[PDB]
Amino acid sequence: DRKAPVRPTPLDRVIPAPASVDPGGAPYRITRGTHIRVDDSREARRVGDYLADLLRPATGYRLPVTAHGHGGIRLRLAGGPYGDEGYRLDSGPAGVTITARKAAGLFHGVQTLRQLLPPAVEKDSAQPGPWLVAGGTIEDTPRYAWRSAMLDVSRHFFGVDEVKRYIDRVARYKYNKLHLHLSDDQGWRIAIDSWPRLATYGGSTEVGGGPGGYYTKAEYKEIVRYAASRHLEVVPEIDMPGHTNAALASYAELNCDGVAPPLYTGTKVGFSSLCVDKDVTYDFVDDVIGELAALTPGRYLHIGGDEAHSTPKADFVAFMKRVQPIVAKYGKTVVGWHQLAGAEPVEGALVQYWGLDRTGDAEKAEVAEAARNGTGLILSPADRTYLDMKYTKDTPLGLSWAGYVEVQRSYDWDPAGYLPGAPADAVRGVEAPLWTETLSDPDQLDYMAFPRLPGVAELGWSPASTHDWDTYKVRLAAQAPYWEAAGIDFYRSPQVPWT
Ligand SMILES: CC(=S)NC1=CO[C@H](CO)[C@@H](O)[C@@H]1O
Ligand SMILES: [Cl-]
Ligand SMILES: [Cl-]
Ligand SMILES: [Cl-]
Ligand SMILES: [Cl-]
Ligand SMILES: [Cl-]
Ligand SMILES: [Cl-]
Ligand SMILES: [Cl-]
Ligand SMILES: [Cl-]
């Protein structure tokens, strides 16, 4: 009977683990007459409608959203110790109430509520339920404010609707940032009006050849809009000065020898570089960042900086000295991969660490030295949170350059002391990147993202006090029938005792 439990989900059985769980008393039961009652604002109705949309198919209930009356489900904005993102959830026969300071907090509370409900809530046709929500109180706040998921759309392109699907997968677990890898050697995926061939030519293929694709400005604005309605701040990346072949192939004049290389359809790295010695390079960078800044309402622009292995250290430092201030010129905070830690991060910058256990002490020290010097740290170790990494040697998709990453390995660590010598106050949070050298459709994205995606969300959200593999894997095993009912393919790890 694992498809419809006799009894409700325990109040504590939630990913991420809530900061505080106080089970007690009888559950609330949603019945055909339940109303979703919201505050009288466009943003409170927005969350209510989002909740109503999640529940209507499987309940068959009308679930009207109103700002009058005493709804059995109440989303209220109120003072409280909940920050921009925390919430309180109270549940019992008198109703479910979710209280927060800001809409993002109500939305996060919605994400807990959908796991308190039974797996049948994922179905697109009406079900018995019963629509029970365990009784008690959850009081929940995030440990880290940077909790991001990356999608690589350069290696294989994914259109607006496929990004919206992936957006909805991550929203489940209280991620608050969506990092988009918009350019690389195999693709340029954002239309730039000052440099139109970047999209029309540089976007014309992908890994393995054939059609590629790109986002018109309107498509990209719709992605940003959609992400925002799921409370994801979009962090765009234009990788530079390496991983730049699609741009180089698009404009001969950007190449140091003035000859445009061919379009790249392979799956290797390191061979491309912008021309640090040419003035146009910085005209090009300034136009691109300018246009991307304008499309970007979030606070951050990612300039990459990884694997510039055809850029000698001194030219790479030079290049980064010049381009970093362009970002603040257009009003944004710079993010780079942690190679930037070795080219003088500007005030306010963050760096994303993608090293592994085999990384050497000198490289890790450079990153911890930048932390000491005030650079924020985003942690995404390649042998922890790279969702493109194989689980075992038998995984059919993915890469293995970082070894194999089973479910326990991905989950079982503490960002706060992970980097030797790094002040734990320098750690802004975690990211789970999903690179697409090997992935070309959304079902494939799912199989590599699930089941590790929730775990990295937990490292970003939950108190370290709640961290424990043996109890976490029980909570994680409970997702199986939810994912099955939703059509989310996932790797049935033997380490996880699946429900
Ligand atoms: C910042 C990083 S990770 N650079 C890269 C190396 O590893 C990834 C493969 O896992 C690849 O897609 C990407 O270009
Ligand atoms: Cl209606
Ligand atoms: Cl009233
Ligand atoms: Cl908000
Ligand atoms: Cl029914
Ligand atoms: Cl925030
Ligand atoms: Cl989903
Ligand atoms: Cl190749
Ligand atoms: Cl390679």
TrEMBL record:
Residues binding N-acetyl-D-glucosamine: R155, D306, E307, Y386, D388, W401, E437
SUPFAM superfamilies: (Trans)glycosidases (SSF51445), beta-N-acetylhexosaminidase-like domain (SSF55545)
Substrates-to-products reaction catalysed: Hydrolysis of terminal non-reducing N-acetyl-D-hexosamine residues in N-acetyl-beta-D-hexosaminides
Chain ranges of the Beta-hexosaminidase bacterial type N-terminal domain: 13-140
Keyword flag Hydrolase: yes
Positions annotated as active site in the UniProt record: E307
Keywords: Glycosidase, Hydrolase
Keyword Lyase: no
Any one Gene Ontology BP term: carbohydrate metabolic process
Pfam families linked to this entry: Glyco_hydro_20 (PF00728), Glyco_hydro_20b (PF02838)
Segments forming domain Glycoside hydrolase family 20 catalytic: 144-463
InterPro entries: Beta_hexosaminidase_sua/sub, GH, Glyco_hydro_20_cat, Hex-like_dom2, HEX_bac_N
EC numbers: 3.2.1.52
GO molecular function: beta-N-acetylhexosaminidase activity
Disulfide links within the chain: C256-C275
Location of the region described as Disordered in the Swiss-Prot/TrEMBL record: 1-26
Cellular component, GO annotation: membrane
UniProt family annotation: Belongs to the glycosyl hydrolase 20 family.
PANTHER family: BETA-HEXOSAMINIDASE (PTHR22600), BETA-N-ACETYLHEXOSAMINIDASE (PTHR22600:SF57)
Name this polypeptide is given: beta-N-acetylhexosaminidase
